[PDB]
Amino acid sequence: SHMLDGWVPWPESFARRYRAAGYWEGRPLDRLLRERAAADPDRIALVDAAGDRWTYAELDRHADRQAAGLRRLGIGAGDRVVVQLPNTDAFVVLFFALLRAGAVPVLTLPAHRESEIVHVAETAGATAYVIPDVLDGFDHRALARAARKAVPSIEHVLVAGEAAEFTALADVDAAPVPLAEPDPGDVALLLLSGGTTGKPKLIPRTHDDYTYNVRASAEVCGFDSDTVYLVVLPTAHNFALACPGLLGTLMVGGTVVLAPTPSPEDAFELIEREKVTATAVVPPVALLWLDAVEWEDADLSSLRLLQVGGSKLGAEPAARVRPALGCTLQQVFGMAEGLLNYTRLDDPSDLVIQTQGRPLSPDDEIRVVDEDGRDVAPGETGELLTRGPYTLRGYYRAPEHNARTFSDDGFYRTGDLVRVLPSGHLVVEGRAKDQINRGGDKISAEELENHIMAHPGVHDAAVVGMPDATMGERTCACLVPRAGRSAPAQRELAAFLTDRGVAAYKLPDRVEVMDAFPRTKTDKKELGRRIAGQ
Numbered sequence: 001s002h003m004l005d006g007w008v009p010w011p012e013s014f015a016r017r018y019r020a021a022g023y024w025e026g027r028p029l030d031r032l033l034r035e036r037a038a039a040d041p042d043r044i045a046l047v048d049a050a051g052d053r054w055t056y057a058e059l060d061r062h063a064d065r066q067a068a069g070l071r072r073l074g075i076g077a078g079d080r081v082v083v084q085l086p087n088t089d090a091f092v093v094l095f096f097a098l099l100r101a102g103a104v105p106v107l108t109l110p111a112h113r114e115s116e117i118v119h120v121a122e123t124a125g126a127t128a129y130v131i132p133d134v135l136d137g138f139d140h141r142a143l144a145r146a147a148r149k150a151v152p153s154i155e156h157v158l159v160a161g162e163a164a165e166f167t168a169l170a171d172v173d174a175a176p177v178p179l180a181e182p183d184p185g186d187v188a189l190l191l192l193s194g195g196t197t198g199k200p201k202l203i204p205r206t207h208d209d210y211t212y213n214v215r216a217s218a219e220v221c222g223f224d225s226d227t228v229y230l231v232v233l234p235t236a237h238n239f240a241l242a243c244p245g246l247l248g249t250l251m252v253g254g255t256v257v258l259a260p261t262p263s264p265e266d267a268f269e270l271i272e273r274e275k276v277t278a279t280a281v282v283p284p285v286a287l288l289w290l291d292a293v294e295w296e297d298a299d300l301s302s303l304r305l306l307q308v309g310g311s312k313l314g315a316e317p318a319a320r321v322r323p324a325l326g327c328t329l330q331q332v333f334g335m336a337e338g339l340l341n342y343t344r345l346d347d348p349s350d351l352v353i354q355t356q357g358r359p360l361s362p363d364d365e366i367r368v369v370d371e372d373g374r375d376v377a378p379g380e381t382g383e384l385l386t387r388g389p390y391t392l393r394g395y396y397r398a399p400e401h402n403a404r405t406f407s408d409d410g411f412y413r414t415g416d417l418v419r420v421l422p423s424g425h426l427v428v429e430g431r432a433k434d435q436i437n438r439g440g441d442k443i444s445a446e447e448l449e450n451h452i453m454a455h456p457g458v459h460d461a462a463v464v465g466m467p468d469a470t471m472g473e474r475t476c477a478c479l480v481p482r483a484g485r486s487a488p489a490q491r492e493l494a495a496f497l498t499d500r501g502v503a504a505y506k507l508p509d510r511v512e513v514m515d516a517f518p519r520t521k522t523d524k525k526e527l528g529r530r531i532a533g534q
């Protein structure tokens with residue numbers, strides 16, 4: 001028996017083996033903060049961009065008060081709560097407060113707009129939605145009004161800032177109350193994947209598998225109480241939350257430092273000020289930092305570890321990380337679905353430069369298969385399938401997609417093309433899935449195509465990735481015009497999609513109008529050629 005329906009538990013024989021192996025320890029995710037605050041109450045747990053800071057005891061106490069306040073509003077055992085917050089201390093407190101109340105956080109990104117928010121709130125039957133007031137010039141309260149109109153289950157909107165007619169997140173506060181613990185085998189939180197279908201898919205992560213994710217990642221990355229970790233990616237990104245991210249830093253007793261943006265201005269200042277020793281970035285930001293040290297005077301010497309993942313970091317900039325940034329590079333090929341590959345901190349420099357790591361767990365199972373589904377010869381390129389103690393057996397409330405995306409014996413089909421080397425290290429070689437990787441941001445082609453086809457001048461749309469030297473891929477929207485109408489140009493299409501509530505990283509970089517698409521279904525390899533003029 002589980003608190004939520006709509007997800008796919010592990011078969012009992014696998015659960016047994018993961019508990020016996022010590023992976024699944026039987027503790028709720030919030031216990032990592034409870035235990036650290038009990039052992040190290042006066043250590044500095046969290047520092048925000050302004051320079052305010054909190055001890056483990058202070059953070060633990062505040063999570064308890066906000067948990068009790070959430071219960072006063074009726075937010076509790078099993079309720080799904082959409083969270084959309086910036087990199088501020090409000091997120092960290094609310095994350096643990098939701099857990100201790102028994103609510104299930106549904107983590108979205110600040111950049112998400114009405115289309116994504118309404119879909120995940122709908123799919124999760126969410127009862128509450130947590131927003132900033134205004135962030136990066138966008139008023140999220142209007143989005144919450146639009147979300148409430150489309151999703152009647154949303155009863156509460158909690159605002160970090162001026163709450164307008166809603167509830168101020170700072171007012172969610174009460175005397176702590178005895179709160180029951182959740183079952184560690186139950187879903188702890190729901191992550192968002194870019195996906196490959198017409199809707200983003202929700203990833204259920206349980207207490208046991210996410211604690212293992214965090215704990216084993218912290219071990220491999222050498223996180224301990226001496227770690228000062230700079231959250232440069234959004235707190236809701238799996239990379240920065242749990243790999244090992246801020247949760248790993250808190251588990252082991254380090255200091256989490258929140259960066260408001262990844263710019264050198266903000267990040268280089270916080271690295272020097274707080275003596276940051278570790279952080280995680282996407283390759284476009286790695287390239288930006290590698291340039292910026294040549295004109296920035298910040299002392300970055302405290303940096304010991306730079307994790308880079310989300311798209312493939314090239315071998316040439318990878319080799320520059322030690323000379324330029326004075327730290328160890330760790331390549332990370334991970335996914336919110338589960339499987340994490342890490343280079344080890346003492347791997348020979350060859351493997352740090354040339355590979356995307358080897359799997360985190362001894363019981364991460366790897367298969368590399370050809371177009372027919374048969375295992376490739378060792379060292380051949382094929383699609384990566386994987387199964388393990390923290391990789392899902394199915395997406396949340398997506399039966400039909402689950403039937404397509406998981407093999408009969410439970411292997412998740414990643415859509416990534418890889419080689420496995422004799423050492424077990426992976427080299428990422430490409431993608432099989434119909435999803436564009438734009439600087440680490442994942443763009444489901446089918447979701448974007450359906451948005452574009454809603455435009456009155458558009459009859460058909462095929463979204464095609466274009467190689468880019470610093471962004472990895474850009475987005476080209478190939479358009480068949482509506483019968484007797486003109487298709488829009490780039491700027492009109494972007495305005496249409498923004499008004500429709502499409503996150504800005506999904507806006508096409510380029511529009512190409514044509515009479516028909518090549519057919520094999522649409523042949524996107526041939527579309528690439530026609531786009532390139534060949």
Ligand SMILES: Cc1cccc(O)c1C(=O)OP(=O)(O)OC[C@@H]1O[C@@H](n2cnc3c(N)ncnc32)[C@H](O)[C@@H]1O
Pocket residue numbers: 192193194237238239243308309310311312313331332333334335336337340356414416428431437440442
């Ligand atoms: C980066 C990361 C670290 C830890 C936890 C995460 O969760 C994530 C993350 O990126 O989460 P995503 O959900 O975006 O997963 C989509 C994934 O990104 C692609 N990818 C990811 N790292 C890659 C790399 N180092 N080199 C080439 N490609 C990579 C694949 O396509 C794959 O499937």
Ligand SMILES: [Mg+2]
Pocket residue numbers: 452453454455456457458459482
């Ligand atoms: Mg149309």
